[PDB]
């Protein structure tokens, strides 16, 4: 419906209003929050991605971390070094972007959305994420909490290098303090810059909490979301497989 309204042949011209570092000084990562002005012209549901065309033409996708009723949209971008120091194609472009610079978007893209009944049915959720995979969850929280008549339970597993590497820490803390009876967040730190290692640490933590995890999934009929690390998918699916199924209708995946 909003899908591929803007493409590489007709991209949506936008403006950068804000560019802020998302990590604290002890993080080895370099990550930027981008505040993008689209004049209310970019159309999306929470969970969608947008394509950025560097140097506007080969677009890269980024999960939108803002919600629908926010004027601007937002995005969280890790700076990739080094190209397989040196910079990745879109990373180098983002690195040198300044506020008020033009930026061209394609989209919306993807199907990593909430079920349409979410607020009415009070659906329960498990969100699993590593690194920038938190983005779509922040946008889910803003929508679900009407950021207020959603009374379901949400559990988040989030793996990162260390404390200072937690993206959107402010939003997460806000939501947990604000709705302590609806939100439980389990942080996992790896202290390994390698992503395959990080997904071991997250699998291990779900492992250690297998009892609550399976209680939530089987008994509370959770919708389970996995994002965005490639090496996180199988390792989590392996905990459900080795214990539990046509649903298999509540697993949602967006990895890269």
Ligand X SMILES: Cc1cc2nc3c(=O)[nH]c(=O)nc-3n(C[C@H](O)[C@H](O)[C@H](O)COP(=O)(O)OP(=O)(O)OC[C@H]3O[C@@H](n4cnc5c(N)ncnc54)[C@H](O)[C@@H]3O)c2cc1C
Contacting positions for ligand X (CB under 6 A) = 49, 59-63, 76-78, 80, 83-84, 88-91, 110, 132, 135, 228, 254, 256
- Pick between residue 122 and residue 231 the one whose CB is nearest to its own copies: 231
Per residue, the 3-state secondary structure of the chain, as one string, reads CCCCCECCCCCEEEEEEEEEECCCCCCCCCEEEEEEECCCCCCCCCCCEEEECCCCCCCEEEEECCCCCCCCEEEEEECCCCCCCCCCHHHHHHHCCCCCCEEEEEEEECCCCCCCCHHHHCCCEEEEEEHHHHHHHHHHHHHHCCCCCCCCCEEEEEEECCHHHCCCHHHHHHHHHHCCCCEEEEEEECCCCCHHHHHHHHHHHHHHCHHHHHHHHHHCCCEEEEEECHHHHHHHHHHHHCCCCCCCCCEEEEEC
Nearer to its own copies, 84 or 181 (CB): 84
Residue 243 lies near its own copies (rule: CB under 8 A): no
State how far the alpha carbon of 42 is from the alpha carbons of 19, 134, 151, 249, in Å.
19, 21, 30, 30
Helix-helix angle 169-178:135-144, to 10 degrees:
30
Binding to its own copies by residue 230, rule CB under 8 A? Answer: yes
Count, residues near its own copies per rule CB under 8 A: 13
Our finding on whether 2 is near its own copies (CB under 8 A) is no
Ranges within 182-211 binding its own copies (CB under 8 A): 194, 196-197
Partner whose footprint covers residue 231, from its own copies, ligand X, none (CB < 5 to 8 Å by kind): its own copies
Contact 223, 144 (CB under 8 A): no
Minimum distance of its own copies from residue 190's CB (angstroms):
11
- CB closer to ligand X out of 11 and 228: 228
**20 interacts with its own copies by CB under 8 A:** no
Q: How far is the CB of 195 from ligand X (least distance, A)?
A: 11
Instruction: Find which of ligand X, its own copies, none residue 83 binds, CB within 5 to 8 Å per kind.
Output: ligand X
235 binds its own copies (CB under 8 A): yes
**Which residue, 17 or 31, is less far from ligand X as judged by CB?**
31
Judged by CB, which is closer to its own copies: 102, or 196?
Answer: 196
Shortest Å distance, C-beta 97 to ligand X: 13
CB of 124 to its own copies, least distance (A): 26
Indicate whether 255 belongs to the interface with its own copies (CB under 8 A): yes
Is 84 or 85 the residue whose CB approaches its own copies more closely?
84
- Kindly identify the residues of this chain, within the stretch 42-101, that bind its own copies according to CB under 8 A: 58, 84
Tell me how far apart the alpha carbons of residues 110 and 214 are, in angstroms, rounded to a whole number.
28
Residues at the contact surface with its own copies, assessed by CB under 8 A:
58, 84, 194, 196-197, 230-231, 233-235, 254-256
């Amino acid at each position: 419906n909003f899908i591929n309204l803007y493409t590489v042949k007709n991209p949506l011209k936008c403006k950068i209003v804000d560019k802020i570092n998302l990590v604290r000084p002890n993080s080895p990562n370099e990550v930027y929050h981008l505040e993008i002005n689209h004049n209310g012209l970019f159309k999306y549901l929470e969970g969608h991605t947008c394509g950025i065309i560097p140097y506007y033409r080969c677009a890269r996708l980024y999960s939108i971390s803002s919600s629908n009723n926010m004027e601007n949209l937002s995005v969280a971008i890790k700076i990739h070094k080094y190209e397989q120091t040196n910079y990745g194609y879109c990373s180098g472009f983002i690195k040198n972007l300044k506020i008020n610079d033009d930026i061209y978007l394609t989209g919306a893209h993807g199907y990593f959305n909430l079920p349409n009944d979410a607020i009415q049915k009070n659906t329960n959720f498990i969100f699993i994420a590593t690194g920038t995979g938190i983005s779509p969850y922040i946008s889910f929280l803003k929508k679900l909490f009407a950021y207020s008549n959603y009374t379901g339970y949400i559990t988040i597993y989030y793996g990162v290098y260390n404390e200072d590497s937690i993206l959107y820490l402010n939003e997460l803390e806000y939501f947990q303090k604000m709705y302590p009876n609806n939100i439980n967040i389990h942080y996992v730190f790896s202290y390994k810059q390698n992503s395959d290692a990080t997904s071991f640490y997250v699998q291990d933590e779900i492992y250690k909490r297998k009892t609550e995890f399976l209680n939530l999934f089987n008994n509370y009929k959770c919708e389970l979301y996995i994002c965005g690390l490639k090496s996180i998918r199988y390792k989590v699916m392996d905990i459900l497989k080795s214990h539990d199924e046509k649903k298999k209708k509540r697993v949602h995946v967006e990895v890269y």
